[PDB]
Design a binder for this molecule. Structure first.
Ligand SMILES: *[C@@H]1O[C@H](CO)[C@@H](O[C@@H]2O[C@H](CO)[C@@H](O[C@@H]3O[C@H](CO[C@H]4O[C@H](CO[C@H]5O[C@H](CO)[C@@H](O)[C@H](O)[C@@H]5O)[C@@H](O)[C@H](O[C@H]5O[C@H](CO)[C@@H](O)[C@H](O)[C@@H]5O)[C@@H]4O)[C@@H](O)[C@H](O[C@H]4O[C@H](CO)[C@@H](O)[C@H](O)[C@@H]4O)[C@@H]3O)[C@H](O)[C@H]2NC(C)=O)[C@H](O)[C@H]1NC(C)=O
Ligand SMILES: *[C@@H]1O[C@H](CO)[C@@H](O[C@@H]2O[C@H](CO)[C@@H](O)[C@H](O)[C@H]2NC(C)=O)[C@H](O)[C@H]1NC(C)=O
Ligand SMILES: *[C@@H]1O[C@H](CO)[C@@H](O[C@@H]2O[C@H](CO)[C@@H](O)[C@H](O)[C@H]2NC(C)=O)[C@H](O)[C@H]1NC(C)=O
Ligand SMILES: *[C@@H]1O[C@H](CO)[C@@H](O)[C@H](O)[C@H]1NC(C)=O
Lengths: 408, 408
C-alpha cells in the first residue's frame, strides 16, 4: 500500500554559480539570486545544513569586490531572527571560531556544531536550506562567498513543495539532535524521524503541473531511520535502472576509502551498465591544483573499457576552470564543485563527492526524481559543459588548460 | 576439531608439456608421467575428461609427433584385460569417439555426462586417479596434441592415498551423473562428503615435510557439504597474499563468456594491489582463437600501475611460435596452463578464469600451503615463462610474435 499523495504545486528550478570569466556561447538563475529571494520571502523559519562558513572578505583575508554577494547574503541572514524568523544552523565542527556564526548568534539565531568525527569518523558535508517548511535548496554551494562568484556550482531549489520540505526537515532534525553536547546516535531513532517516502514508494507530487515521483536519500547509514533510503542505494538504483545513457559530473571520483580500502560499488555499477546493457557512460571529473593525483589511474582504468568488441562505451573528460593573473590571488577558487547524475529516465542531485567515506561515514543527502522537465534541463547543463573548451581528454597537455591540473 | 592427519609418504612432481620447437635457457613431461602411471596400475583407474583425440585418425592428420598420444591409448587398452577396473567419464560429445569405442571393447567402462542439460555447462575437468593412490590433475586433455604441440602444466601426486581417495568422491559425482536420467540430488548422499577443505585441510607429509592440502570443486550444485568451492579457494589465495600474485591462465575474462559482468576475481586482484601493495603479474595466452574482448579488460587492469597509488599490476601475453609445418596441425601451438602462485601458497586448476567455469562447468583445483618446495618450483616455471622471448607487452606489434594473436 502506497503512502498518501501530495497536492502542493511544487516547482523546481536548477540553480548554478558560474565563476567570473567563464563564458559558454549559448540560462538558469544564479545561486546568489535564488538565496536572496528565499531570504526575502522568509516569514517563519530557516534550517541550514552546512559544511563551513566564509561569507566575507575578512573570513578569507582578502579585499575582493567578488565577495559582495556573499557579504550581502550574510547581511540578510542576520536580519532574519529580529523580524521573527526562527533560524537553526547545523555546521560541521570547525577548527577555529567562526565569525559569521558569532554574528548570527548575536542576531538571535541558534547554532549547533556537529562532531561527526567522533560519532562516525566523517564530517557534516551536507549543504541544504529549508525555508518556511515550504521551499528548499539542495546542491553543491557551501556558505562561502567564493561559491557565488569564483567556483562553479549546481543545485536545485524546490518551491511550494511542503510535503517534500517537511521530509527534508526530518534529516535536518537528525543533525540537530546530534548537535547537542552529550548526544549519541541511537540504535533505533524515534519514530518522528521516519519516512514513508523512499525508493520503494516515492512521494507522488505535482511537479511543474505534471505528476512525478520524488524522494530524498541520506548518508551515512547510522543516520538513516527505518524507512529512509541510503544515498548509495539510491545512486546505484539509478545507475542500475539506466538503459540508454549515464552522464555524471562530480568534482572528485575515487573507487576507494579516500588503513586504505578498495571500494568498487559505483565503479562496478558503471562497468556492469556498460557491458551488460550497452549504456553510454560519460564521466566529467573536475581538476585543479588540489586534485588527488591517484584519481588518474582509476579514471584511465574506466576509459580502457571503450572497445568495439564488447561494444562497451565509457568516456572520461576533466573540466578545468581557467584562472587569470588577478583570479589566481583568490584562495581555494576556480574549480567546478558540481555533483550530479542524469540518465534517460532519472535525475540525481547530491551534496557528496563520489568516494566511499561520503557513503559510509560522512553526512550527505540527494534528491531523486522520475517524470515522463527537470531531467532534460540537467542533461542540457551536462552536454553544455561536456562540449565546452573547458573539458579535456585524459591525454591533454597540462599548460593548455588555463589553470593548474595535477591529473594532467 | 581437525580431521585425522595423513601418514602417506606423498610426493608431488610438477609435470609439463613443452611444444616441439620452444627453447628455454626441467620437469618430467606429461607423457612420461602418464606412461609410468599406466604401467604401474594394478587395481583401478578413474579418468575425468573433456574429449578424446589421442590418435592421428581422430584429428585427420599424419603427424609423427602424435606417436606419444597413440602409445598412451595403447597402454590404456591393456588395463582391463589385466584386471584393472577402468571408469572413464567424458563430457557428452557431439559425435562418436573412436578412442572410447576401443576402450569399451577392451573392457573399460565409459559414461558420458550431459552437463549442458544439468547445469548449462560442460565437463571440463582433467584428472586421473590411479589405484586410489596416485593422481594427475592439470591442463592436459586426452589429446595427443596435449603431449607435443601445446604447452601444458599439471601435477602428479604419488603415494598419497588419503588425498587420492578424496579426489575419488568428486569423480563419483561425475560417475553418478553419467547414468541416464540421474538428476543431481538437492543434498548429496553422505558418502560424497569430505572433511578436508579451506577451514580444515588435510595434514600431509609432502616430500618429507609437513604441508596442508585440499581439493576444491566446481560447479556449486556438484559440491557436497564439506567441499570448498573452486572460486572460494582461488579467492582465498588472492586475499591471503601479502607480497606477490603470479597467474598464468590461457583465457581470463571478467564476464560470463544473456550477458553478465563478473568481477569476483578482478576485484580480488584490484583489492590485493591497492590495499596490500601486492605485485600482481598476469600472463595470458594468445593465439588465433583468442576472444578479442579480452584485450580491453586486460588494459583496464594494467592502468592501475601508478606511482601515486603504488599499485603494481602488469600484464604480458604468451605466444607459442609456429613454423610453416606446425601451422598445419589443427588447434595447437598455445599455452593451456592454468595456475596461480603467491609467496605463501600454490593453486593448480583445470579451469580458465571466466565465470561459467565457476558457476556451471565442472572443474577441480589443488591448494597447497607449506613452510620452498612445490611453491618455489611453480614460481620458477612462472618466472621462466614471464622473462622468455615468448612473453610480450600489450603494445607489442602483431608481426613480431611468431603466430597469429588476436589481442595484438
Ligand atoms: C611410491 O612408493 C613406491 C613403493 O610402494 C615406490 O615404488 C618402488 O620403487 C622402488 C625403486 O625406488 C622399487 O624398487 C625396486 O624393486 C625391485 C624388486 O621389486 C619386487 O620386490 C619389491 C619388494 O618387495 C618387498 O616388499 C613388499 C612390500 O613390503 C613385500 O610385499 C614383499 O614380500 C617384499 O618384502 C616389491 O614391492 C615389488 O612389488 C611390485 O611389483 C610387482 C611386479 O611389478 C607387482 O606384482 C606388485 O604388485 C608390486 O607392484 C616386486 O615384487 C628391485 O629388484 C630393485 O632393485 C634394483 O634396482 C635398484 C635401483 O633401481 C638397484 O639399487 C638394485 O641394485 C637393483 O638393480 C628396486 O629395489 C620398488 O619395486 C617400487 N615398488 C613398487 C610397488 O612399484 C615409488 O618409487 C614411490 N613413488 C615415488 C614417486 O617416489
Ligand atoms: C518550473 O517552474 C519554474 C517557475 O516558473 C521555472 O523556473 C524558471 O526557469 C527559467 C529557465 O528555466 C528561468 O529563466 C526563470 O527565472 C525561472 N523562474 C523562477 C521563478 O525562478 C522552471 O523552469 C520550471 N521547470 C521546468 C522543467 O520547466
Ligand atoms: C618431491 O619428490 C619427487 C620424487 O622424487 C621429486 O620428483 C623428481 O623431481 C626431479 C626434478 O623435478 C625430476 O628430475 C625427477 O624426475 C622427479 N621424480 C619423479 C619420480 O618424477 C620432486 O621434485 C620433489 N619435490 C621437491 C619440491 O623437492
Ligand atoms: C509559489 O507560490 C507563490 C504564492 O503562493 C506564487 O506567487 C509563486 O509564483 C509560486 N512559485 C514560486 C517559484 O514561488
Amino acid at each position: 500500500q502506497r503512502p498518501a499523495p501530495c497536492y502542493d504545486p511544487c516547482e523546481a528550478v536548477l540553480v548554478e554559480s558560474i565563476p567570473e570569466g567563464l563564458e559558454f556561447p549559448n540560462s538558469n538563475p544564479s545561486t546568489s539570486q535564488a538565496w536572496l529571494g528565499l531570504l526575502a520571502g522568509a516569514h517563519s523559519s530557516l534550517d541550514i545544513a552546512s559544511f563551513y562558513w566564509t561569507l566575507t572578505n575578512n573570513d578569507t583575508h582578502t579585499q575582493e569586490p567578488s565577495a559582495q554577494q556573499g557579504e550581502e547574503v550574510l547581511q540578510q541572514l542576520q536580519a532574519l531572527a529580529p523580524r521573527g524568523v526562527k533560524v537553526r544552523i547545523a555546521v560541521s565542527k570547525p577548527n577555529g571560531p567562526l565569525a559569521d556564526l558569532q554574528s548570527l548568534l548575536q542576531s538571535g539565531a541558534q547554532v549547533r556544531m556537529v562532531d561527526m568525527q567522533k560519532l562516525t569518523h566523517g564530517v557534516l558535508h551536507t549543504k541544504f536550506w529549508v525555508v518556511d517548511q515550504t521551499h528548499f535548496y539542495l546542491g553543491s554551494a557551501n556558505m562561502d562567498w567564493r561559491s557565488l562568484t569564483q567556483v562553479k556550482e549546481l543545485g536545485v531549489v524546490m518551491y511550494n513543495c511542503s510535503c517534500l520540505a517537511r521530509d527534508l526537515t526530518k534529516i535536518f532534525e537528525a543533525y540537530w539532535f546530534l548537535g547537542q553536547a552529550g548526544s549519541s546516535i541511537p540504535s533505533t531513532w524515534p519514530r518522528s524521524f521516519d519516512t514513508r517516502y523512499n525508493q520503494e514508494t516515492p512521494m507522488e507530487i505535482c511537479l511543474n503541473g505534471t505528476p512525478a515521483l520524488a524522494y530524498l536519500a541520506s548518508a551515512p547509514p547510522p543516520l538513516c531511520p527505518s524507512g529512509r533510503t541510503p544515498d548509495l542505494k539510491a545512486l546505484l538504483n539509478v545507475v542500475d535502472s539506466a538503459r540508454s545513457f549515464i552522464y555524471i559530473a562530480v568534482m572528485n571520483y575515487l573507487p576507494t576509502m579516500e588503513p586504505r580500502r578498495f571500494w568498487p560499488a559505483i565503479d562496478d555499477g558503471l562497468r556492469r551498465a556498460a557491458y551488460e546493457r550497452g549504456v553510454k557512460v560519460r564521466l566529467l571529473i573536475s581538476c585543479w591544483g588540489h586534485s588527488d593525483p591517484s584519481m588518474r589511474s582509476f579514471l584511465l582504468s574506466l576509459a580502457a573499457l571503450h572497445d568495439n568488441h564488447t561494444h562497451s562505451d565509457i568516456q572520461v573528460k576533466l573540466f578545468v576552470v581557467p584562472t587569470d593573473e588577478s583570479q589566481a590571488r583568490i584562495p581555494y577558487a576556480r574549480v567546478n564543485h558540481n555533483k550530479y547524475m542524469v540518465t534517460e529516465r532519472a535525475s540525481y542531485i547530491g551534496t557528496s563527492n563520489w568516494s566511499g567515506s561520503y557513503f559510509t561515514e560522512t553526512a550527505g543527502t540527494s534528491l531523486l526524481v522520475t517524470q515522463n522537465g527537470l531531467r532534460s534541463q540537467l542533461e542540457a547543463v551536462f552536454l553544455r559543459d561536456w562540449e565546452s573548451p573547458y573539458s579535456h581528454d585524459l591525454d591533454t597537455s597540462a599548460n593548455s588548460v588555463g589553470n593548474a591540473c595535477r591529473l594532467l
